[PDB]
């Protein structure tokens, strides 16, 4: 089947149409890279059902590039767009540069995402802000980052780790609150936990009118 831009289900392995190497999982066969849903809160969202429509000509702002695994795929999806990946920890970042080196559509921003104004003169108006940051003020960083660059009628996907926000409070009530707190700026499109793949996260798709 075909669910996304360059997203298919070879036999039963989620993969993206690419002509690039294995950044993490040597899962690369004839023009496709296996997207390990166990190493990507995104490949998981896709499998959980809800997907993301979008043309390759997209301007992406990724908040939490990390080592660059979930990123490396988005780069295959948006092959005719550009990715401004931000990550502030050098450890993982060291591994990130290897991706941006191999690929030519990812822009490295080694700055603190917590304060967008700091790099506000680099990021253009983006069509979507993907966030996979695990910190207490998650929704804040996702909000302020939207103000600055999320072009009106743009969409965002944000991964959330209940505990990241509330140390001791039922994942349900934490997800109950956060969704409400984030509603005030975005319009919900879907939320759903990645239960098998990530027993603590839940994806929220939305956009600001």
């Amino acid at each position: 089947k075909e669910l996304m831009r360059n997203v298919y289900l070879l036999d039963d392995t989620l993969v993206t149409k690419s002509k690039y190497g294995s950044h993490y999982g040597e899962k690369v066969f004839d023009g496709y890279r296996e997207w390990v849903p166990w190493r990507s809160k995104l490949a998981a969202m896709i499998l959980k059902g809800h997907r993301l429509k979008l043309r390759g000509d997209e301007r992406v702002l990724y908040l939490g590039a990390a080592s660059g695994t979930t990123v490396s795929h988005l780069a295959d999806i948006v092959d005719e767009g550009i990715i401004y990946a931000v990550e502030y920890s050098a450890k993982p970042f060291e591994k990130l540069l290897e991706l941006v080196r191999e690929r030519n559509n990812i822009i490295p921003l080694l700055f603190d995402a917590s304060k967008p104004w700091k790099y506000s003169g680099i990021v253009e108006k983006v069509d979507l802000i993907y966030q996979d940051i695990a910190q207490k003020n998650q929704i804040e960083i996702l909000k302020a980052n939207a103000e600055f660059f999320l072009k009106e009628k743009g969409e965002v996907v944000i991964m959330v780790k209940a505990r990241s926000i509330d140390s001791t409070a039922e994942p349900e009530e934490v997800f109950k609150s956060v969704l409400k707190e984030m509603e005030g700026d975005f319009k919900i499109v879907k939320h759903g936990s990645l239960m098998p793949y990530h027993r603590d996260h839940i994806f929220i798709h939305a956009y600001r009118f």
Binding site: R59, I82, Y88, S89, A90, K91, F93, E94, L96, L97, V100, R101, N104, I107, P108, L109, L110, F111, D112, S114, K115, W117, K118, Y119, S120, G121, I122, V123, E124, K125, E147, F148, F149
Partner: protein, 236 residues
């Protein structure tokens, strides 16, 4: 009408940086959403290479960071600052203990003390010279503005380079010697009392920038000190 984009300063025109996009890249300071597409305003400046160049730039700074964090020289400095104050703590509670003995008897051992204190007040002036040597190499843009002494303490109080580089300008004019240490800078110290606070804010703001440029560029940029001295005169 000053905007700081990665290639230059827009207002309606455009002034690029002398083969230094890496600098303004680290300098793209804007405190409020832009009313234009940096991308477009940039297409109307750089050819189609826009992206290629925007990339080569974002890659250079990224590497320097990973380059320093491989050397961990900034760590050496923190340990250094943390040892200084310590070496200093003893110098004192050992003068407190000697004048204690000395208030009683002036033995031929109270002397061995004095020399050992001295020998120790030497290591202090030895470690202080060290933080200067590195700080001038691993963190010029900063040492430049406040001076090795101060610059290095922020780094230790911050913890590390990357740990500091993400500090707000407000936490900087405070994190000081646990009226932060930046408050003792001449430009601040020689003002009135109420308007000096408006100097810290600017110094802190530009200092945080110096910190970033040091960590990702490694090379000085007098545009920094410049702004500070100027904004200083303005204070009258």
């Amino acid at each position: 009408l000053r905007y700081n984009l990665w290639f230059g300063v827009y207002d309606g025109k455009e002034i690029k940086l002398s083969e230094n996009f890496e600098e303004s890249f680290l300098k793209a300071e804007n405190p409020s959403p832009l009313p234009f597409n940096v991308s477009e305003v940039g297409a109307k400046a750089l050819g189609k290479d826009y992206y290629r160049i925007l990339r080569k730039t974002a890659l250079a700074v990224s590497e320097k960071m990973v380059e320093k964090e491989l050397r961990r020289e900034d760590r050496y400095v923190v340990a250094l600052v943390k040892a200084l104050e310590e070496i200093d703590e003893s110098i004192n509670m050992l003068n407190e203990k000697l004048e204690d003995i000395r208030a009683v008897k002036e033995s031929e051992i109270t002397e061995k003390f004095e020399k050992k204190i001295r020998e120790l007040r030497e290591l202090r002036r030895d470690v202080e010279r060290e933080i200067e040597e590195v700080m001038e190499k691993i963190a010029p843009n900063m040492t430049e503005l406040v001076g090795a002494k101060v610059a290095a303490k922020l780094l230790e109080r911050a913890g590390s380079m990357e740990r500091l580089v993400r500090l707000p300008a407000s936490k900087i004019q405070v994190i000081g010697a646990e009226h932060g240490i930046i408050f003792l800078h001449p430009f601040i110290r020689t003002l009135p009392k109420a308007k000096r606070g408006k100097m810290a804010r600017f110094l802190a703001a530009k200092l945080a920038i110096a910190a970033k440029i040091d960590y990702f560029r490694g090379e000085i940029d007098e545009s920094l000190y410049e702004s500070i001295r100027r904004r200083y005169e303005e204070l009258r």
